[PDB]
Design brief:
- The PDB classes it as lyase.
- This protein is an all-beta fold.
- Strands 1, 2, 5, 6, 8, 9, 10, 11 and 15 form a nine-stranded antiparallel sheet that branches. Strands 3-4-16-7-12-13-14 form a seven-stranded antiparallel sheet, with no helix packed on it.
- The radius of gyration is 16 Å and the shape is globular.
Amino acid sequence: SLLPSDILDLTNWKLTLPINDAEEITQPELDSYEHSEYFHVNDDGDAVVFKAHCGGDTTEGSSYPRCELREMTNDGQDKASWSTTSGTHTMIIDQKITHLPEVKDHVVVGQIHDSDDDVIMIRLEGNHLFVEGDGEELADLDTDYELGTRFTVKIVASGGKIKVYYNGDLKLTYNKSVSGCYFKAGMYTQSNTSKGDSEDAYGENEIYNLVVTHSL
């Protein structure tokens, strides 16, 4: 029936999977792609489900599995790359987190990433939703987050700073001067079997709306 490309504008994204050696699905194949377990439209027909299990395959340089979109440009053919000091770069994600690993109950659901590592990540640890940078907490978004709760998170990079909003309310203004940045959205499960989780434990979220904008 409906495909993820019918719910979200996937033109300028590529997908990394938690299987097949962390396979990438790029455009134009992504326009017609789904995976019944990891990347598909929900039963209600109004959001895309992203699932990554703790036993999944991982990308080179990470120990954690993902089912995650990586920002592209030019009809999805070129890698996005922008700077926090030139132009204005915005991502809005309207989503709900639906499942966490049992032992290390940690997931990431939105990032800015650069050539080397994450710049910021939207992170849920249990009921604690916060912005992480350099592996430490930068600001709380919600200290009482219940699974299944729809929220919006907006990230704006401009002027040598990064702003993060939660349901419209500014929660963080963070100085940062970095280039080679790009957005990510989906599910990045921060556990694996070495943490004590089972192979079939998983993180899962549902994205209802997703937008990236850029201005000079």
